[PDB]
Symmetry: D2
Subunit: 292 residues, 4 copies
C-alpha cells in the first residue's frame, strides 16, 4: 500500500532495497532499521519529527516490505552488509543508525562491522542482545524468549508464505504461553516468515555471535532498554533482553572502547518509536546532538 512518504529502490547487487527518505538532504543523515516483521513505515511518525533536523532514511530489510525476498539467504551478516551497501550507494555520508529489536542488533552490527567511518553512532532501541540467539553466551535464548512466536511463523506461515495458514497461526498464537505470540496485519503480509525460521533454528547469527560483535563496536552506542520481565508460568523472558543480558552487553561495548549510553525505560513498549514517538525522538535527538 502507499504510505506517508514516496518510496525509492536501489540495487545493492544481490537484492533491491526499498526505502523512504525525509528531511533536508544536507542535514545529518539518519538510517532507521525496523524490527522483525516491520517495514520502513514502522518509523513513519518518527521520520516526520526527525526530518525537522535530520536527513532520515527508513529501509525495508531483505525479506521484508518491498525489498527482495531471498530464500536461504537470511543472516545477520547479509542483513548488515545490505545496509553497508545502502550507506555506500545511497547515503554516501556518515550516518547515525537507529534500529529497533532485530534492527537494533543490526545497528550494533554496523557499529562494529560496517566499513570504516560509515557510522557516527548507533541507537539500539530495545535490542534482543543474546536473547535473539539460539546459543547465547549470556542469559535466555531465543527459545526462551521470542522463539515461540518464530515457531508459529515457521510452521503455519512458512518460508515465503508458502503455507499461509493465517487462521492456524492465530489459533496457536492465542493458545500460546508467549504474550508476544498472543499479540493479516499489513506489515506481516510484507514479511517473509523465513525470517522466523532462521531465528528459531539459530542460523541467522551462527557466524555472528553477539559477544564478538558487541566487543568490537566502534561508535558511540545509545542502548535503550524497554519493558522486560520473567513469565511466571514458563520462566521465559518477556521483552527484548533481560537485565543480565543488558549488563553483559554494556560491559562488552565498554571493553570495546566506545561511549555507551544506557537508557532504561522499563515502562515503554518494545516499539517506542511508534507508541511514544515524541519520547523516542527526544531521546535520539539529545544523544545524536553530542556525537560529531
Amino acid at each position: 500500500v502507499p504510505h506517508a512518504y514516496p518510496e525509492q529502490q536501489v540495487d545493492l547487487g544481490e537484492i533491491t532495497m526499498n526505502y523512504a527518505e525525509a528531511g533536508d538532504p544536507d542535514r545529518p543523515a539518519v538510517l532507521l532499521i525496523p524490527e522483525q516483521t516491520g517495514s520502513w513505515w514502522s518509523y513513519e511518525e518518527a521520520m516526520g519529527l526527525l526530518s525537522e533536523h535530520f536527513h532520515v532514511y527508513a529501509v525495508d530489510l531483505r525479506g521484508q516490505g518491498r525489498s527482495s525476498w531471498t530464500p536461504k539467504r537470511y543472516s545477520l551478516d547479509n542483513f548488515g552488509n545490505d545496509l553497508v551497501r545502502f550507506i555506500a550507494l545511497v547515503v554516501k555520508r556518515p550516518v547515525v543508525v537507529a534500529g529497533n529489536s532485530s534492527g537494533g542488533v543490526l545497528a550494533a552490527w554496523l557499529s562494529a562491522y560496517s566499513m570504516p567511518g560509515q557510522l557516527r553512532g548507533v541507537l539500539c532501541e530495545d535490542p534482543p542482545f543474546f536473547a535473539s540467539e539460539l546459543v547465547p553466551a549470556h542469559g535466555h535464548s531465543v527459545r526462551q524468549g521470542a522463539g515461540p512466536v518464530f515457531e508459529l511463523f515457521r510452521t503455519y506461515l512458512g518460508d515465503q508464505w508458502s503455507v499461509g495458514d493465517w487462521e492456524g497461526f492465530c489459533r496457536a498464537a492465542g493458545a500460546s504461553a508467549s504474550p508476544m505470540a498472543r499479540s493479516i496485519p499489513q506489515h506481516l503480509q510484507e514479511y517473509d516468515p523465513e525470517w522466523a525460521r532462521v531465528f528459531y533454528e539459530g542460523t541467522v547469527g551462527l557466524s555472528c555471535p553477539h559477544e564478538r560483535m558487541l566487543g568490537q563496536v566502534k561508535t558511540p552506542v545509545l542502548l535503550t532498554h524497554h519493558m522486560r520481565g520473567i513469565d511466571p508460568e514458563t520462566g521465559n523472558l518477556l521483552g527484548a533482553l533481560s537485565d543480565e543480558q543488558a549488563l553483559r552487553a554494556r560491559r562488552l561495548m565498554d571493553s570495546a572502547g566506545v561511549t555507551v549510553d544506557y537508557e532504561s525505560v522499563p515502562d515503554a513498549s518494545y516499539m517506542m518509536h511508534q507508541s511514544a514517538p515524541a519520547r523516542y525522538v527526544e531521546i535520539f535527538t539529545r544523544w545524536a546532538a553530542a556525537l560529531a
Copy 2:
C-alpha cells in the same frame, strides 16, 4: 590404564557394547544400580558401594566410553546410554531396581524413569543432575555453554575423541592424568558441547514423562560474577522447572537441597549420600 579395585569386575555383552560393572551385597537384598558421573567409572562409587552393600544388592557400571566398557565413536547419545542400561537391568539385574545417578548419570537416571521398559525401575535418585544445564538448547535456564561447556571444550580440544590428541600439557595450560580421566573417552565432552548427545531427547519431554518416584538432590550451585555462568549442575530455576515437569508427569518428586556438597557427594561425603539414599529408598 585400568588398575585393580576393591570389587571384582565383570563384563556383560549388551549387544553393541560390552559393559564392565561391579557387584556388591546379597542377592536377597533390593537391587540397586549406580550410574557414574561423566568421566567417572563404576569405581566412582567404590566408597558408597561399601555402605550400600550392607542392605542392598548394588551394581556399579561403566557406561560406554568409560572404564572397561566399549568405546563407541559417533554413537554417544542419551538414548544409547539409557538403552545400554535398560539392557543391563534386563540381562544382569533381572529384577526391579532402584537407580542412582550422579550428574550426567543423574540425567540418565531420569531417562530410565521415563523411557525404561515397564516395571524395570522402582525409583531413581538423580544426584545433582544437570537438567537443562547440560543441554545446548534447554527449554529453561543456562545452556551447557554457560555452565560446564568451557570444561567440555577443553576436553574436546586438547584431549580429543578417543584421546586422539592427548595434549595434556596444553589442557592444563588452557585450564599426571587422573585415573578416571585415563579411562574416559573425551568424545563424551564433544557430544555434550555440540548438543548432539540429547538432540533426540530434550529434557523437558524426558522430565514430563517420568514414571517412577524421583529424588532430586541439588548440591552446590551459584553464578560466577565475572561471566554470569552457572556454577554447579543446575540452577534453582532449572531445578524448579524440572520438578514442575516431573510433578506434572504424576510422580512423587522429593527434593533435597544440599548447598554445601560437591557435585560428587557419593565420593566426597559417602555417608551423607547413603543416608539420603537409604532414607528415600526405604519409603518406596
Copy 3:
C-alpha cells in the same frame, strides 16, 4: 479426513494388538503358529503394519509372523522430538524381548530395512538370526552419508513437502498445498509427518551413522536392491540407494564378518512385499531357511 485426530484407522485381515514398551505403545498384528520360527516385519516410512498384510498370509505357512506399527505410524504412539533410528531400533529390541520372546528373522522395507540392519548390529545378543533389508536407503536416507547421494538428493524433496504442508503430527494438514507443490492415501493418514522432518533435517540418524552400523552387523544379511536410477533433470537418486551405495554397504557388512546376500531386482517396485508378494516371500523363505 483428519489424520491429526487419529480417527482414520480401518479394519484389516488380521486383528491388531497393542503392547506397552515403556515409552510407547506399539500396535502390531500376528499370524502363524507360535511354535514356528518367529519373523518380525518392519514397514517402510509412511507404511503401517498392514503394508505386509498379504505377505503375512504367505509367510504364515512357514513362520510365526509379527508385523508392527513403528512409533509415529499406525496405532502406535506419536512421540514428538523423539524420532531417531536408535529409538526406533530399541522399540523393536523391546518388542522382541517382551512379545516375541524368541529369536527372530527380521525383514524391513525402505527405512524399515535400515532398522533391520540396525537390529543386526545393535540388537541384544541372540535376538536375531538374520535380517532382510528390502530396498533399504543405506546412506541415501542420511543427510551426510559417507557414500553417494544424501537424503536431500533422494527422498528429501518429498520429505520437505511432508514437513512443510503436513507438519508434525499433521498440525498443518494443508493437503491442498501439498498437492499443488507436488483423497489422502490410507497409509499416509496413519503417518506422523515429523518422520519426514527428522529425515530431512538429518536428526534421525545423527548419532547412528550407517557406515558404523553396517560395519558392525552381527547376523547374516540379505539386501534386496530394487529399482534405481538417476533423474535427468536434477541428477537426484531414483529409488532407495544407488549401486555405489549398495556396493559400499556390502563391503562394510562383509568386513564385519557376516554372510551377505545381494539380491538385485532392478525391475521391482520399492515395496516388493506388496507389489510382487510371491517373489518377495520366495526370496525371503529361500534365504531364511538357509540360515
Copy 4:
C-alpha cells in the same frame, strides 16, 4: 609460532593493507594501474603469494591484486566469523575501497567458490567476469544439492586441521597432524599453512561456512561471464571418496544452474593439472586466464 602469528616472511612484491571495517586486509599489487583490474583469491590455506609466479606474467597485461582473506596471511583472524558471506563481503569492500574499478576475479579452490560468490552477490558493476580455478562447487558444502559432500572429498583434511591445529592454531599439534594425516605432509609445516587460521577448516567440516549461502542459490544467480576450469578429479576405489575439487556431475549441475542465470559459461577441462595450477604450472594457468579474459 603460528598461534602468535609470528611467521610471516617477505615476498617478491611489497605488501599493502587496507581497513575494510571489521578486518584489515593485506594484499599485494602489480601491473600498470591503467590496465584492466584483476583480483586473485587464493585457495584455502593459501596466502596472496600463492599467485607470486602467476602475478609476474599477468602483470604484463592486467592490474593485478592478490589478497589475503580473513583468517589467512597477514589479514585479521576473526574467531567465530568465518563464512562465505563474510569472505565475499570483505572482497566487495576491497574492490570498493582499493580498486574502485570493475575487476575480473580469479579464485582457486575455496577462492573460486568466492569468485562465483562475487559474480552473484557483489555490488552492481563491480565485476566484469570470474575465473573459478578448480572450484569445489557443492563438494565444499556439507549438504550439497548435487554430488559428493565435503565429508566425501576434502573433509578428511579439514577434520585433521580442526583437531590437531585447532582454532587460531590454539592446539598447534602439528606432530599429531602428521601422525593422523599418515593414517587417514611432505615438506614440513608449509609456510602458507602457518599463516592460516584452522578455524577455516572447522567451518567447512562442520558445514557452517555456507549454511546461509547454498551454492545452488549462488550459482543460479551469477550475473557475469564465468570460466570454470576443471583440473584433476577422480574416485578413490578403496573409499569411494572424491579426488580433486569437484566431480564432473557437480561441474555439470553447476554450469546448468549458471546457464539458467543467463550468463556465458565457459568450461575448460584440464584433467592432468593439480588443483593449484596457478602455482604448480603458472604459465599454463596464465594462458587459460589471458585467453578467456580477452
